[PDB]
Symmetry: D5
Subunit: 197 residues, 10 copies
């Protein structure tokens, strides 16, 4: 409804200053050519649902990297606020040490380009975007503020998009690794339909 994020088309490019391993570092979408990217927005640092989502993704950052997928968090907060929040204990609502980059959308350009900017508050909705190695947007997930996303589901989607990528098949509803896929043509799809019904 706003922005430029479109399924099947190149994901909107982004460049931003990020906090990587307690240090400031520039991050841009071009750095991930050939790797999947899970870009997820959150409204504000030092809030409530946001830390649980950042922590949950950081704890499982390696589960995505094993698959060749890098996870990126972003809010409109500056990299100094990110660093401060990272230097705050998790028991106090902080992030503690983080295994994923944390971008600073101080210009709001990323949130606007991805159409997740809640304009009346100038903060980003809980928008999650899955981008493939070729820089093409594959998936969009946006939540209202009071409800957090699921890292399990985001991982399942990355897996499904990679498995259908290389084997040229399509994944049924609820597909998880190890489950059958469908050969997307009239004749060969009968194998799946006759087996599972």
């Amino acid at each position: 409804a706003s922005g430029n994020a479109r399924i099947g088309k190149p994901a909107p490019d982004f460049k931003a200053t990020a906090v990587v391993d307690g240090a400031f570092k520039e991050v841009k979408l071009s750095d991930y050519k050939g790797k999947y990217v899970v870009l997820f927005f959150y409204p504000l640092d030092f809030t409530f649902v946001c830390p649980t989502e950042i922590i949950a993704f950081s704890n499982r950052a390696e589960d995505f990297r094993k698959l060749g997928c890098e996870v990126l968090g972003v809010s409109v907060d500056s990299q100094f606020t990110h660093l401060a929040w990272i230097n705050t204990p998790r028991k106090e609502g902080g992030l503690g040490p983080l295994n994923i980059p944390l971008l600073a959308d101080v210009t709001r350009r990323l949130s606007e380009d991805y159409g997740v900017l809640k304009t009346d508050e100038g903060i980003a909705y809980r928008g999650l975007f899955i981008i493939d190695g070729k820089g093409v947007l594959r998936q969009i997930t946006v939540n209202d503020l009071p409800v957090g996303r699921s890292v399990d589901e985001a991982l399942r989607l990355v897996q499904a998009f990679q498995y259908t990528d290389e084997h040229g098949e399509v994944s049924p509803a609820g597909w998880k690794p190890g489950s059958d896929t469908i050969k997307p043509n009239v004749d060969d799809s009968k194998e799946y339909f006759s087996k599972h019904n």
Copy 2:
């Protein structure tokens, strides 16, 4: 973020002819005031990922209804094509008897209003939308065509939005019924962060 579909705003209204218990009947968004709605688009009838999603939501339809949530499917196909597909055995790629309405979007107005129309093919992306009893859009999920959605995650989101709606709290990442929520203010949020860290 989808055509006229904006989170926090009234969901785009819709009226369409649908197949309900094997017969044609009108379906309007106004029919579901006071109830949650999961509206999910799929590209084409008589294809491959689509019947598995439609069948999944139909099997789980009562799980949503016991929560006061009505599930609706929709594609650009006519109700006559829907009925023919319903009358095709699932063993042959059909749908069999269904427990959810199947809306016909032959004017492509629903797909266009919810910004899920793949313009170069004229079919809707795998867009899913969660609307609350007040008619407000709460969640947007759009997958590329090769990968199906998750009914389990859709149910979790409906559950989290209903719970946070009732108790004025917010659900952390991966929240499920029984898990703790967070009191969204600086002071009371410490109860959760200290308990879980």
Copy 3:
């Protein structure tokens, strides 16, 4: 009133996936250079007048091919729906095996280019168009939905256009093969007028 189908001018180009001999194949207008084309639209698959028209043209398919004319049916339905309709017995309202291509116009591009789209329903009127071997539109026939067309008249028109094309004469009202044509000049036409009055 809408579209680009003008008599005497090149027929609007079209390109679409079609069901040919139970398989999906691409169909272009350019594929018929040098041959006549009867392109007839119909509103919806699995309806009532449409099967009788499609079946009637399929039975007479060779009556047009003997004359170097190819018949093509089209509707906004997909090739997967077309194929399902073909695989439905005629006694049950289906098409059965078909002797003509059945194009899918899911993007509504063909219907809009040929100005037959019923906007308020998103379906094509019963528009029929006759195109000569040079890609020029010779005839337009659009019926409202309740009334089916006449395969006999379509054959008569193709015959008349081919005859007048070759001999440079003009066919009178109700002309059929074996009937007198008129030499379109003041002097030579007197032959016809004196004879038939």
Copy 4:
């Protein structure tokens, strides 16, 4: 599909001077409210196909008026040229006495309103339009200049439109008086399909 001539919409209004029983008289579409109207354009008086179409319709004008349908011929020629042609014997290419009005479209307004004007020559194509008693356009037929229309098919279409009007059924391909029509709903339509297949 013809200028302002759109199926299912009110036919473009017209008012023109016409030759009626050898005298000049004003004719307007509103004069035929409650009756069907067959309005056929032809390019030029004192030509070749045109007299055969006018004569054929004239000879069968009473077959249409027995159905409550009025036949009207139109061309850009003036009422004086019309009358001169009526006063020319048919053996010499004239029309002789006529049993249908012959409107004069000297301003080209009717031809432009019905989208049949061949602009590079200033003459009307061979457009035929069927209008019901409510003034709604039901059928469009347009031939290139060298081929004449069929009065039989025009009468069949009038009959079909009046029959489907009265009984709420739909007429299949090639339907003629006395043949079966289809009940346009899924269940009741099976009667026809099993009987005729």
Copy 5:
């Protein structure tokens, strides 16, 4: 007030099919380079004032041609109607054989370019235009429909424009061949003024 005919400027070019010696022929202004042209429009064939004007100019055609001036008649009627009028005896209101071309302005292009089209009826006023051998418009005469023109005055005007072209003098009111002219300068003009007063 309308059109492009302007005195002292190149006369609007024209090209039309005409009846010449009982046959059809293309006529265009460029055909008359180096010759004077009298182009007279008339509203409708088979009317009342028009045949007398056409007949008059036809009878006087050689008076004009002896001065190197060609006379052309034109109306919006087609060449077929022109010929049928020519084949009507003058006793019955026809033209009989003609010695001037009769142009068919069926596209109304000529009438519009010369600003004589009576828009509310689609017919040309009684506009007469004199053009010199260089294509430059010299005279405009336009009569309302009920009053015919004067061939004597048309001849007189052609004679005047030709005499003044050759001798660089100007012709006073009512000048005819043999009358005195005025040398157009203050000193030499006194010769005429002192003699004629």
Copy 6:
């Protein structure tokens, strides 16, 4: 066809200072309601063709007044130049005593409204206009500068328009008082055509 001068429409209104009987007087078109008006423009005072036209109309003004027709001359010159020209003897190129008003079009409004202004020189062409007692323009005559007009033809045109006005018939070519007119309908017109051919 001249600026706002359209045949059959109300003649462009005008208001100008004029020399009448050697004195200045305002003249306006409404002054001549119920009377015919011959309004003739001429380029310049103290030139060559112009005095011969003005003098000719002056010498014959009473011939027009006997018919209820008032003649009016006009040029872009001022009333003071007009008066000086009237006070110049005709032997010296002057006008001498005049019997018609001589209007001053110093603002060029009349020439512009009547479409006769030679823009590159700012002077009026030899435009003559006939207006009936109802203010409707009936005749346009415009000569190039070097050729003067004919008072004989102007009078004949006034006689013809008043006769056709009064008796509802049309005057044929070269019609003069005493000659036959044509009753403008198909049947009654045969009287004239058979009598005169």
Copy 7:
């Protein structure tokens, strides 16, 4: 307020037919490069204040030519009216023989370019313009119609503009030849101020 005459900028170029020594001659601004020009407009020939200004400037023409300044008169009247006015004795309100050119602005271009055209009357106000040898407008003087201009003041200005051009000093109020000028700088100007106060 209107036109292009801007002091300090190149004077508007003009090109007009004029009366020079009883004969017609083209006159352009370029003809006067290297000389001063006093261009004075007046409303109408054969009026009242105008002859006194044209005569006054004529009788004083040699005083301007001795300075290298040419005096030009112009009105919207034609050259034929000018000459008639020149050929009118001064006792009868004429100009008699003139020693200055009298330009004809029949197209009103000169009056429009110099912004002195009294639009509602089509005549020029009493505008006077002083141009220098380089074609630069130096002075504008426009009187309402009932008040004549002053040749003395026009001469004083030409003298002042030539002296200040020559000596690079500025002339005080009322300066005439022989009076002191001011050195336009702070220090040297004190010479004048101390001496004249």
Copy 8:
């Protein structure tokens, strides 16, 4: 002819702070209704020609006031600079005590509205304007910067406009009190032209 300054039309309204008898006071055009006004612009305070003009008008102020005419000076300088200049002795290039107001056009609105703003420098040319008691502009005078104006000519012009105002006559070239005026009609003007030639 200056910005909004049109002779014969209401002079552009103006209001501005002025120095009056050594104090600051608002001065607006409406203050002088019923009195003549000479409004003269000058470029810059503390310059060279400007003081001599201001002083010249100041000394002659009562000569204008005895005629019912008020004199106003204006520049883009502020009133404080005006006062400082007034407090500067004349021997030092100052104005000394002043008998006329000195307006401050700091916004340049007066200079722009009267079309005298030398834009490249931001100062007013030496524009003088005479306005009558009706608020109508009667005279425009604009000198280039090096040459000062004549207070004598300004007084003569005021005298001439007031005289022609009261007596309905017109003043010839160089008129001064005592000289003859002209009765502006053809007949009565003869008295003057005969007496003076």
Copy 9:
């Protein structure tokens, strides 16, 4: 000079969530009617020059309040970041307890409305604004990022505007409470000038 911030006009209205005494509280410009306001922006929380300015104004807060002036700080950081920064000890670069509100401009509306937004980084320049008790903007101070502002000068300016407000006088350069002011009129201003020179 700042977006909508204009000296002498109503200051841009604002409304924002702010941290006050360690808690969140809405703050709007209307709350400070009758009181002066010092609104100072700073780029980012947890940076370097900002805390020194914020601390300096907080330490002097009562000096401003004793004068009836309220000091407000604002950055584009959220109120949660502000609080966290306030809860960081000053020795750690935090703010520690504050005695002034800390507004959050996360929508950037305040920074945009006051024209201090560094667009390329999305942060506010070191802009300080002084608003009087009537809501009018009186002073603008904007510093480049690397140079902090002066609380002494800000206080001096508030005192100067309050003093000049109540006595209708003007404060010289460097004025401080106790020093002399100037009566802003020519005569009375001499008291100050002679005394201090």
Copy 10:
């Protein structure tokens, strides 16, 4: 809000005639490349606060030049008014001899380019601008008219910008020469924050 002065961007270029050492000289921004520039506008010469700000900056001119900073004063008054004011003793409200250039902005270009023009009065606000040696605008100070600026704060700001320029650090609030600056990164800024707290 108006103009083109933006912090951190090249200062708007300017060129003007100025009074330097009692003489006129052209001044432009390029003359000060590599030097800091303090450009301060003031509304009007011969007023009250303005002379005290000009004298204050003049007496302190060398204090700025010792730092390589040049001070420029500018108002809309002309250089002639500047010089008259300089030649007025300070005791009488004048400036006396000056040690800084005084620019003349008679075209208001500078004031408009720097967005300090009080448009309703045509005078500049008390806008002070600090431009560095590279021509980049570093600081904006705009005071309402009745309150004078502080030279001490201007000097302080120039010192801070020059120190931060050279040492790549940032100066805290109230910094003056000899005080500590801050190393602008998270790790090194702790040196300042722990020492001073």
